[PDB]
Write a protein that binds this ligand. Structure first.
Ligand SMILES: C[C@@H](O)[C@@H](C(=O)O)[C@@H]1N=C(C(=O)O)/C(=C/CCCO)S1
Ligand SMILES: [Zn+2]
Ligand SMILES: [Zn+2]
Ligand SMILES: [Zn+2]
Length: 231
């Protein structure tokens, strides 16, 4: 039932309700002659919504806001980008124009600026050291250490036992490393073990791209990273 990359036309966004007040958003982008899905999260915060990650570009993110308006009907008041790449910050300008307060760690904000990407406005304190966690409305934000990127955060929704890994967690059908240009391959398994140690109770683990699963996705990701290391 989870929407697959083959069912979403680029420019369109789907929502998938995981638990009471918890949804993933799924969009697609064309990249190098292939089409890739991408996930983010939506978490109900009283009578408002917290958005985790853009929908990978301005057009998709505008479509995301329209689909939230239509299907949920509560305002997106805050958004967090989990690292500085375009599948997470691309669309921040759209969100800001719509009155969404955008947030990222100071590490992510700096890297986005260096990369010429869109820059979330507000800085999230308390995430500078591996293993740091902070509460942000209805979620917990966790910096596990460098992995897919040096700034990558993961997000836990305690009420639903939902762990969103962003691009630091791969889906099971991904057997080779994705974009690792900005990755710390040497630290990535250690960072994943920090995630496992902090959220052993997680029931629903969402990768940055593709199908959700259980905590098996963490060991899967380590396997793929280590195999790539030994390439
Ligand atoms: C575009 C930029 O956002 C990328 C990034 O975030 O590194 C996107 N995400 C990933 C990932 O591996 O998680 C990609 C893998 C396929 C690309 C070859 S494309
Ligand atoms: Zn990335
Ligand atoms: Zn503000
Ligand atoms: Zn990605």
């Amino acid at each position: 039932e989870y929407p697959t990359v083959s069912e979403i036309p680029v420019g369109e966004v789907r929502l998938y309700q995981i638990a009471d007040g918890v949804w993933s958003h799924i969009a697609t982008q064309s990249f190098d002659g292939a089409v890739y899905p991408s996930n983010g999260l939506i978490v109900r915060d009283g009578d408002e919504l917290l958005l985790i990650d853009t929908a990978w570009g301005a057009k998709n993110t505008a479509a995301l806001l329209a689909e939230i308006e239509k299907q949920i009907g509560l305002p997106v008041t805050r958004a967090v980008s989990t690292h500085f790449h375009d599948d997470r910050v691309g669309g921040v300008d759209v969100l800001r124009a719509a009155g969404v307060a955008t947030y990222a760690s100071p590490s992510t904000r700096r890297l986005a600026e260096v990369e010429g990407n869109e820059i979330p406005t507000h800085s999230l304190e308390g995430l500078s050291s591996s293993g740091d966690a902070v509460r942000f409305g209805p979620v917990e934000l966790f910096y596990p250490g460098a992995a897919h990127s040096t700034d990558n955060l993961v997000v836990y929704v305690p009420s639903a036992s939902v762990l969103y890994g962003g691009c630091a967690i791969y889906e099971l059908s991904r057997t080779s490393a994705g974009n690792v240009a900005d990755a710390d391959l040497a630290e990535w398994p250690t960072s994943i073990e920090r995630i496992q140690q902090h959220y052993p109770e997680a029931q629903f683990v969402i990768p940055g791209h593709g199908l959700p699963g259980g905590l098996d996705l963490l060991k899967h990701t380590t396997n793929v990273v280590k195999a790539h290391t030994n390439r």
